[model samples]
Target chain A: MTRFDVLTVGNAIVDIISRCNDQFLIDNQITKAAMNLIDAERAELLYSRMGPALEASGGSAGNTAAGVANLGGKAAYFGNVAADQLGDIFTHDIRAQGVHYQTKPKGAFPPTARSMIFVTEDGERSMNTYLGACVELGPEDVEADVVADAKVTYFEGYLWDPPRAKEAILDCARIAHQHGREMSMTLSDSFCVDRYRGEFLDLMRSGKVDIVFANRQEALSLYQTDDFEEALNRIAADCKIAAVTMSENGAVILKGRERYYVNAIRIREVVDTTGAGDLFASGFLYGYTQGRSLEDCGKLGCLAAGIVIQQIGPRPMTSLSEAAKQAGLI
Target chain B: MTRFDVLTVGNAIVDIISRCNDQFLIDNQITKAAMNLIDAERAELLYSRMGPALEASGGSAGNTAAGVANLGGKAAYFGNVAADQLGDIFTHDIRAQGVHYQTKPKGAFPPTARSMIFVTEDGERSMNTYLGACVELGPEDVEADVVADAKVTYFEGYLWDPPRAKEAILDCARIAHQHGREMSMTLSDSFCVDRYRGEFLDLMRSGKVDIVFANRQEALSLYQTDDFEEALNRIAADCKIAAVTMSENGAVILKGRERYYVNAIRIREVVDTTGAGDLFASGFLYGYTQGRSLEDCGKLGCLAAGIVIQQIGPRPMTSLSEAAKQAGLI
Candidate 1:
């Protein structure tokens, strides 16, 4: 049997980042924090005007897989890529980080997904995404043994984006439950939560989902509750474990009557908050699999997010064993 | 009747320059100061290995046209570009600089020509060029009215590369002579001289070539003589006017019994030597057309070269009028 810790499934995206002002966003008719799907024609039109772009591998699950790998966990990723220049770059980058990725790049239809990131002076990132061949991912690509071998099958809510990707995630969750393994997930974004709230509720209420990862804004939007206490109560009752991150207020992990109010590691500069939650899951899950207490897992999560948010991109800034061990991870 | 000062015919090449060491040249089988043609497949292979590249519009005559426009002189350009992203950029950039360019971009090739520039720390630049659709430039692209109305026709030696481009250059030369106007051309590179030395000599002797622009190495190599004085006499006897630039030592213009020597301008740093000679032509031709003396024209050329070699791209560092005024031209 293959030794696997966690299996992830989602769209594979390439981040094309360029610095711009807010007027550029207004001129282009793009809304902030929304992953808008654009055609090849629009992509070409936008790319021609872009100043300069740096390409990096970034999908919700792709970042999570990288996070897990960075934290010394064995993980496998299942997604689709197009047979394009961006496709080749995305595949090579992820595979180089030591993750198991065998998804065949499609030669037909839509191209590889690309996110046009506008980084403002305040270090806030406004993203506009085009989900291309990532829509081609389906249940056929998910292996039954791969799901069963993992302690948990994790999926991103952005998978609900393309109908095929939604089916693939549901299939993995089903296979995991059938093998008596718990399932975990992240709400991904507020807009994503708005788009697939009812479907996410059904997945959580069925007891198949053991853990649900969400930030304050996503958690608030998920339950339609303005109060953080109200949303936390609703999420904790639905899933066996609710890991809700409240930015500076740290994280709230609830499993039955046991609750952990984890403190957020203070950072002087938050360069980017793109993948803080994903890397936090990396640290929390790494601690969880090693039988660490819930409070310690939450502390590890905060520490990991602290490191990643201070830099660009969603991947961990460095290995967890270095300074984190000095902080007494052992 | 159409009114224009001069017309230029050449390729529309995009330069992608990056800094590298001597090891890159050896590994890529490249010789310094020599231009090699790379096909699409090899272009992709080399692109994957290259580091960060800065993009800019560049070509021998293209730079000259832009320079003339910046100096309050009217100039028109004729060339070919594919109806692609880079082609649109090449057209927009030159037009935006106030030069007239009416060449149609071809729909056949997807990408325009791109020069992969590797600038060593010693201030030497080695380039690997992918000609792409520059081969589409032919004799039929030149307009009769544009050539007839101009005082002179400036063309690049690189047109000798593709047989079709060579025909286009010759066609322009014939049209310029038909209008009783002067025709000028730069030898472009020393390696280019070695490739078609016989054809270039024949063209010059036929009196189709009036003014000849050459750097020290190219002038010396063209005569197969180690002495600069011997090459000057040979060039002066054939061409009506020959300006030979000796880099930091400045340039000398030889016209039969009349010879002028000018010193190079002083500069703090040499950022890039990509378009020094091209812009030098810009300054010289601008001074010549405006009725300046030959010695003053060479001084203008030296000052322009000094400004450009200090910056990143081929276009002049600042306003040509200001630069000329500072050099005592005003």
Candidate 2:
């Protein structure tokens, strides 16, 4: 009912994070620093083999919603959980952060989604995500009013994994456009881009998505180009605005014939690397909706992204709004 | 069954830890640094009010079992969990730490036990424990072979809260005595002592428990004495050996009018204080089983206990064995 700054849709997942050595990845055939979609059986096997873990609420777009809300923005989230304890936890945590999330839980028939993330000492995280109740989401679950009222409707590319979530996103995108709302999406990961490259590119070219977000690896995968400049040039041609993260170097924002760059802040002994990119988009999106300059948005994005790695959870223990004020980014 | 240095029995619980300000505890009527037992509805209400949390395996004696195993001592644990996801987590985490845990899961009717632990910036935790499936644990769940094979059979005083767990502890005490194994118990919390003070004294005086463990508050509660020395003297007379923790002053081990004291090590920015007392017993129990001197055992306990508070989880992030070796206590 209230005006919203951002509306996010993605597969809801509880992140089970554990610290392990590099040998753990080799032993289990885990692709380091990548998201691997697995079945329930594989999830069980992997979790059993992993050491003790810390459970926290995390999902690509859900984290973005949290970051935006933490930066003093009005954010709403649409995602699926089951009628289970972890589901109850996810629902409670999101609302506690001042984000409005009213997505109906699917059921207890299938458990809530979980991502088993193993973070090595080097801070690289290998994720094994099990699509649980989120896979059951359909167009019926999307709230049309929320999508229309939001200034921006954002999505995580991982939503393409769930069979009907694509339809759900299309429905949200359709409502967003009719209300003259902006739409944005993140490539999420290289594997995700590889799976939906054509459709992802089409979404940008067809004017459904005005803003696109991706990391270096995803940008490379999307264009099938090893050349960074060519990929940047291609993405700049395909969308009104595109933000690409260049690993340790920093992030680049492209807007017709102009580019803004923000240098990555030095690390503070990274605790984990689970939500760096998601938080990056959070600050960027919040600044964009606030009508800040493109360069200021990039700075906001870089600062928020930097804060996540220094803390343990998917979100920062530090207050993003306060961090932004202290850094003069806000 | 293999011979184990220690066999522990208590409630099995997954710790849901969250950080909040002291006002959160005041708003919720929580008693800081105390473990309060509650029912299912109360747990749900408290959890809904807390912020984002991290879930880890924890229960008083379960932590001791994990600590002993991590310190290179063979350990087996008996506890009850439900056939739920959290139950699976509790089981996997304890076993993953090299502690043997094969207690049968109770039906999911009651769900698994959980402690909603709210930690303040000062690192004090207010615990709200829901006695769930662990309340269903009875003598039927205790394995006779494991009890007999263990050098020491340890029980957490929290076991007295669960109606049938008292019967289970008595059964294990009987089996342990017949096989010449020593029995030990810890006054899990001051609140737990207030409820079962009379029975706890009987257990120590009647020789059902040969070694007793209690913190400063619990020791004072047991004797109804405001004076620390009187409580320490009282505990020394009641049990064959008693270990009493005096907060930052460290711990005192009392045996036959002989006292061994270990100074509490200075902390390194305590992250949370969930399992300090439990881990203290881990080192002492392990050393007792290994035939170490009382002074050496107290040092081991102090060092292990110190490691847990500096880390985030209920268990220590640092390996207990390595820590002890580095301290030249092993």
Candidate 3:
């Protein structure tokens, strides 16, 4: 039996979140509600111009792992960070959330990865990420035993951009399949889907991925169509299970021939939409591992996503397990 | 002759704020609604046990400086921080807010000072501060020219705990007086007032401090009285001006023999009370520097404090200058 319910692998990043307006986005030549990759020079320049910010541990898969752990799931993480102060903060935040992270530091890389997240008045976030030390993760850093020891080996699509980290994810997927463990992947962003649409679809169809998670935009981009129904039909025919989120409209889950529509839980306000999809995956995967019905899994996912959107950061301020129990999802 | 409106000096601290329940305080033997000083060892132990935190640049006077800058005032800050990453963040945040901070680093300390603030559900915060590099601040660190060139030299009572920082405050006060500039001081906390009651009263009475800021608890503690009227009467006779804040009920400003009662502006909610007084001082001093009436200054102070208490951190989320203009206080 696997030792951990989930093992998430991706870029380890600390988010420097600041509040700004639409005018800032326009003046800075930033594309709103999108994730952009910048180098060290651009990162420094952006930060020099941005207002004061709050630092938090946040990466697509890292947030998923933290969500799982926060909801009382047994979770482990695999990512690379340099032995620097930001790395130390990232490690502490994840570990403090009760996630297991045994990746060794002291790498050749200089600094840890960071994302400068600008949140607008509408609660939409524009992310500028600098993949610093995260570029150091490779196949050599992947552990076969750990991959095999997880009930599900989860991969993040963003990691595919870093060539060597792609090798690590592929190796882990193979090990998971060899050990009869299920694997999951999230299309981290729509732009990321545009980058590796062919490979992502092939990976799911090849039986390397048992489940897939994507938002409406990502799903549409993956199928190269603006039609939501067409994207849903395409994923249903290829993937074993596909969970797609539609911000306020709710989520639709396709489990083989069966389809389930889960309405989004109403929130008081939307603080930031940074980790909604990540936490949804956390709740869905948590329920899936426990042999719960797909409808219940989607409900739990919606509930978790609802809670996180009411706060500033990606992490939930309240206990997810208690929240799930209160919602009668457990 | 003054180039700057306000120059604030105190222990430079970054606040690591986390949400917790009342039970957490009881279980951890923490006194609620107070600021407690912890050593390095205690700080480490406390941080390990505390939940994930959001970091913001905060100090009694630092927040005041930030507030002044946010309100379009020309403000400068004096505080000590080590040559560390946290120190860099502190520097960037203050300067980004349009405040001048030119304190040299490379102190004999290893870490920057931090206040581990535990905010309860009701928005009351109990702080555990570790005065790391802040202890390095002394009279030598104070710039006589900088103090003399500011319309108002503001000192935080928290700096009194560090003997050398206390000397720096006194030196700055002397320079301000020599240059015919006003000096202001805040009784940072009730316990802080208790610790330096004799000295604080003497400073105000000796014509060294032109204006004094204190919350109701600190005011009562300073006069060793349970009666609010008695404390007001005591302060009215001793100081040139006294701004005493009463939570929810509003504030009372005693300008010589005349008293101005300013009602607090009701907020949508109270998120944290960490920087309320600091920001209040910021507003009052900003108005004072502009030669506004004492009643208008008190109104601006209440408005500023009202805005800060509604947010998670001490700093204003919106433009305080615009906020004052909208409120017809500017």
Candidate 4:
């Protein structure tokens, strides 16, 4: 077998977090706790007068890559970052965390993508994202060597927004399947699913994708059902392995002749929801790569997500892995 | 006579601070209680894996400008910001603090600047800064009308690194002198003094610069004198007024006929020193603009510095200003 654990492909983004009062959100005409699409100009205008910012390198797959590396897993990341400052920052962050990212930074294009996160006192996050330099990704950006070497290839659904990034994801999936590697994709954001539901439904049915990850709303919406059970049934029938999440309600896993409910790991306080899903996949994939059972894999995923939600971003390995070791998953 | 109280100008950088163990400092090659410059790549490398960060808007002149506005004084600020998210944030923050800033955001750069601050348990701040979009600051960015409108145009001396920023400062100084207004500059950091002692000495000798702001080490270095008294004497002869700061020992204010030694303000704890100097200047200029004597100005400045140093990053206005009210500055 080849010697790579997991390979992640997605946009490389920098998160800029600012604290604001409820009135400030109202004044800006943005709904509280929603992820709104902001053009570069609007993002600029909001940030020019915003308060101090906490910058963290974040993208759905980027967070996962960091988490996997932090857990002592071999990881590699493929994403687009412009040669600009923020782009350089994004690449350095993920790479320094022990994730291999060999794609050369783009020379002339948009800057790196950024999310303007407005966090309230109650720990709710309202995000406004401007996907700048990420627009440069296309099929050619996906390398064949990394995809063929890794046992599992993962991509986020948010990349579908950039048509070129979607092409890259498809190219990686083709290479992974040709090499007999498992392919997984995360339904990154609810709004993103709402935007590309048809294309996603088609992808799920194509049989090229082995694992499908989604939260309750997106899962339910993908199946056009109000009940989560119906959504789970539809997902299990369509994909070889399905993982569906319900915030605080735990996750449900459906695999070849097995099914299990992974209990939610308790949280003292939820500081942010930014990287919860990314970490969930990291935990599951860690278990999967280590030859754990499907049920144990789902439980490990929940444990990882639990530890990450208590803090602001993702990728800090606390005592969770040690606890997981005691529970028999290395 | 001009009508306004204070005008402060500098880079509009937001500070993101994290409390790390002393080992983090040693491993990162960062000195305790010193500011280090890391390019965009390294800043990302360190911050991505760091502990949770506490963020606040801060810059030497930027913080002082905010302090002047918060002290219920008329304040205006000039700085460069890109028409991006971070730029909007910096713009909103100063305006919210009641400082006037009319320069339009630069359309072609990335965003505002960022400073990665690492604070140890003992409250020593070591910084790694990426100037980012702040490099766009140039002479044309200065608004002569804004400089002329204030009684004193204040600038930070640490801005000499970016040659364009230095040009902006000189432009503001020329505008202030043309309007027959006093120009003030702070010798921002001790290391900064090590970098530009020659230029600073020449500026002090030029009569167009009236008031000189320097701390103990900075003033001592300016005259190459070990004795604080000697440094004070040299500065008094060169400028209209010299404010020599001695940290906890308070300050010495020197004019033609008199020298006033002021006592330091007692604080319960020393938290962060990110903007202590800026707030000190805020208190001193608030007193000076209100026609208070040099001794009272020094006392107010020392008191303000003491209060801010006991809190987090530069924007601790609530309890500090209430204490200032008790001290009768309001």
Candidate 5:
């Protein structure tokens, strides 16, 4: 087997994207601008109430996996899906991006996981996810040989519902360190940080997480402060590398007190912001594996994020590899 | 109770679009550049063989309904779907387009219709449609009051596999004429002309069809000659108005002995040509109902067709009403 640049592990999901007015969010009592963990009863009811939607394969890790390969990186993904039509689509979508994914689909019962992403006129996505078959994920699927063959394993292991997926990642992370490979994790949201603040703090402080990814709100949420710089400094002290993102203002990267700031790329329109961070992780990890400078990796990260937000879904319609060439970042 | 500018009656189908190499065609023995009718088994087989795909609401008349409403015209549609997830999508899709669609879903068994469109590098689409619940469309769903309330009723009644839908359009045509509303039809393909040659000729020559829409190849197929002008003359003689499109070369419009030509709108990229003719009819009928000059009507037709081919599916990702402002077509 060939050595891989990145291996993504998280929930296997398809995003059902619908654009609705803010009134709809208020009426539904949906928490705006955050991912809501939901049950099957609530998920079916919510889906029945929404308008037409465009479906795209979009787990945080899956979206990142797509971006990594589209930027000419060899990526692998380990996620669970049920044996159904949507799972077939998820399999083909990642494979089409040239990501190595051979996760076995569950026989039946829970079906494939789905994220219902409702975008307001302001372009913020409020996500409601039914974990479905994602709960079936375990360390059994994460082969030691594959983790050993990869440079880095990026995770969205924030879902702590059943300790199944969380244990799987820590197990894989242990394997990665033994094989001299690095491990990274994204604190997906401020709300996400709340669910596992102690857990994230533990992983970062213990040196298990080599690279830390989080938006400004999430980093501050973890640090228990509104002071941006304090949270930035705290994360910089805890992890080998901490990349804190501030939406359109761009990203600030730090490695051992050496700082780098990258400007956000210009975009014509902001359609959906669902997978912006995932794609940023994709570009950053790709550049990181290539031995590029921290500033350059953050530049590629911003460039990838810029392209995804201008389109309806997380999947960039154009080639990020060619886009990198056009922007002179490659 | 709303008076619609245009009413469309045809198959209710969701388009599953995927890009593939020419070798895929030879391997499957799939017809290129034409609609190939397939049963459930064949459709499922073909879908399994293809790579990843994007699902969009489509059908000859369904796509036209979207284009017409997006051009700021009030439109209505008549089609059939079974009670399934895809049927729910088709309902929401047309309703989202601002078109009147109250067609009831079939109780069970067959699901909503779908067309698997394999697009090649040339951007041409080869279709494999599983009619599913579309075969259930009949005169029972085409209410007379609705047909009488429209300025024009466009039909995609070329699917002569079943006598049901064919009879439904003729039934609709009678009501349209009684209320003095105009009637139109599109020869979806040259192969489609072969399937309903006698019926199309009878409708046109018998004064039931006011406007006939067909591309250069379809018109030549109808006339059974390679002579383009001969087929144009024949169609003009048979129908009150005839619009013949020649892809990028533009379109020729005829009324009585008066002849008008409209140039094809310039496009940046032609990603998929699945609904080019369907959208052309949409713009033509939209402008025609507004009492625009024949040449100007054809210009809008070319404009709508121009926008659709630049995207993946028949649905224009942006507002055509706004795109019209950019092009100065409206």
Candidate 6:
């Protein structure tokens, strides 16, 4: 009997989100629709030049943890943030979301991590992330008891940027499997997959990860192919269940010999696309843990992702459970 | 000879804005659409129970100062916040708006002020404000040179709550008058008007305030009468110039024997009415400093108010100068 439905681990970050135009991105020489790693100097330079921003707690796995909690799932989170102001905000938000978070703040490292997200008119977010204190997270921060006591232990692919975090994920995977629990991971971005393609492949094929989540770009990048069908086929054979999202086209779910397809819920307007994939994993994992059919899981995933893309921030402001019931996913 | 168009003084506050229903108001026994002062314990309790909020720098006179800057007018702000995280956020946001904010953050006292604004379905905002560090603002914080160098010195009536801030406004008025600069004041809230009616009446009638900005309720409360016409006549006699806002009906202006009426610009939707009056002052003051006709000033005021009520926060996200041009106010 697990104590939590899902235990999520990753970087703890606060998002500094602001609106900009396509020209602003070009003027800054920032690549569109991608996450770029920034050092402290770059973060300071970018922030000084960026327009006013709204700060919100956001990270790949953090958003997923908050989403699961918002959807009425019992979720626990493990991450690193410094003993700083932004860290307090990050801690308060997740705890207020009803997610259990007990990671101690380390005071010696860099300040809390922050992602500067520039949202354009087309609802695309170009992120410049300062890893900061997040890089300090190591295997010692991973609570084996917490990981083993959860039905599913989830890892964020973005955590691979910090070598110590990668080692921590391995520790989590070891703990989860030893206790007969499932392990999940999200291929955070195409750039992230490009950085650790072989490592990710080993994690999937070596039976460390039973469930995998990825957006279209990451999916293609993972299999080193431009063909979507080839990537889907490769993932089907590598992992027990892989959820591949194709943005507005929706998502595809493959588990053993079964395949499920779900359409993306149409939005009245797309505001920002920061946490669409993370929330998709949130809804899918919630449904999967509740013993729902694979089709229902995919539908739930699409529903959650759809709701987030229509708003400014990554986390859902409305009740996901009520939304799920209304969408007939429950 | 003035270096700036307006120098506004009031509490520096960070607004924590969240959405709620009418029932939430009833359950909390909070007034429907007014600012209520809360203590530290109450702020904690209210925030813990409220939904997640978006933090934005906001205060009556502070918003007015930011609006003045946003409309391309030279503006300066004087207020008090602690040397804390929320204080840093307030400083960055106001300065980023191009408003000169040189109020030194005091180390001793509470953290930065925060107002929990709960917006209902009708777009009305019920604010629960924690004065916090704002209470530290006194006559010492008032810069005489800064006030004298502005075309207009603006004061927020909410300052009366902190007895010290009331002295600061009086100090500003004396400095502005000594330097031949006009002094302006906003009634802030009807409740605030009711609390300091005699003092406000004396301030206006004694010639300390040259221009008075108020909404319908504040006007009625100031005159201690429900009749709109009686309040209008009383205000016309008490101040050199007065701008009275009437929500969707627009505004009326009075200067000596001259009178004008301007219809409110229609908005696509009213998202929140938190800073309607403040932004109205922003436009009115900008126009006044530009030496525009009173009729044009009233029209600009109405346009600015109309724009802010259409969004969630008090400040304009779009360029007010551009918006004014589009509305034919410029």
Better of 3 and 5 by lDDT: 3
Model 4 stretches with alpha carbons more than 4 Å out: A23-32, A38-54, A104-107, A232-237, A249-269, A292-330, B1-4, B11-32, B35-59, B66-74, B78-123, B127-142, B159-183, B194-276, B279-330
lDDT, candidate 4, B244-317, per-residue tens: 88877988898985899999987888777767777889889988988899998998899888888886667654
Across residues B208-303, which tens digit of lDDT does each residue of candidate 2 receive?
999999999999999888999999889999999999888678899999799998998778787888899999999998888889999888888988
What's the TM-score, to 2 decimals, of chain B in model 2? 0.98
Error of 6 at A245 (Å): 1.2
Worst 10 residues of 3 chain A by lDDT: A102-111
CAPRI-wise, candidate 6 is medium
Indicate the residue-level lDDT of A170 in model 3: 82
DockQ of each: 0.07, 0.73, 0.64, 0.17, 0.32, 0.50
The digit string of per-residue lDDT tens for model 1 on A190-269 reads 88899889989998998767899999989998998899888988998888998989888899899976789999997989
The global C-alpha lDDT for each of the candidates, from Candidate 1 onward, is 0.79, 0.90, 0.89, 0.79, 0.87, 0.90
Q: Candidate 1: give the clashing pairs.
A: none
A1-330 per-residue lDDT for model 5 (tens digits):
447999988899988778888999999999999988899999978887776567778899999989999999999999999886567668878887788998998685578888889998888999999988888998788877778899999998455654599888888889999988999999987888888999988988888889989998899899899899899889999899988888999999999889999999998878889889999998899999999999999999999999999877787867899999999997
Q: Is the docking of candidate 1 incorrect, acceptable, medium or high quality?
A: incorrect
Better of 1 and 6 by TM-score: 6
How do the residues B178-241 of candidate 1 rate in per-residue lDDT, one tens digit apiece? Answer: 8888899888888888888888888889988898899998898788789988998999998899
Model 4 residue B116 lDDT? 83
lDDT of 5 by residue, B1-330 (tens): 439999998889988778889999889998899988999999878976876566778889988988899899999999998886567668877887788999887675677888888999999999999999988888789878889999999988454654589888888889999998999998888888987788889999998888999999999989899999899888889899999999999999998898899999777778889889999998999999998999988989998999889877777756778877787877
**What does candidate 3's lDDT look like per residue over B115-188, in tens digits?**
99999999999999999899889987888888989999999988889768888888888899988999999999
Candidate 1 residue runs with Cα over 4 Å from true position: A1-105, A108-134, A137-163, A168-330, B1-8, B12-21, B39-125, B145-154, B176-184, B201-220, B224-330
What TM-score would you give candidate 2 relative to the actual structure? 0.97
Q: In candidate 2, what are the lDDT values of residues A1-330, reduced to their tens digit?
A: 439999989889999888899998999999999999999899989988988777889999999999999999999999999999889878988998888899998679689999999999988899999989988988988889899899999998998889999998899889999999999999999999999999999999999899999999999999999999999999999999999887578899999879999899898687887899999999999999998998888888898998898877787766899999998876
Question: Model 3: what is its DockQ?
Answer: 0.64
Per-candidate alpha-carbon RMSD to the true structure: 7.9, 1.5, 2.0, 5.8, 3.7, 2.2
TM-score of each: 0.61, 0.97, 0.95, 0.75, 0.86, 0.95
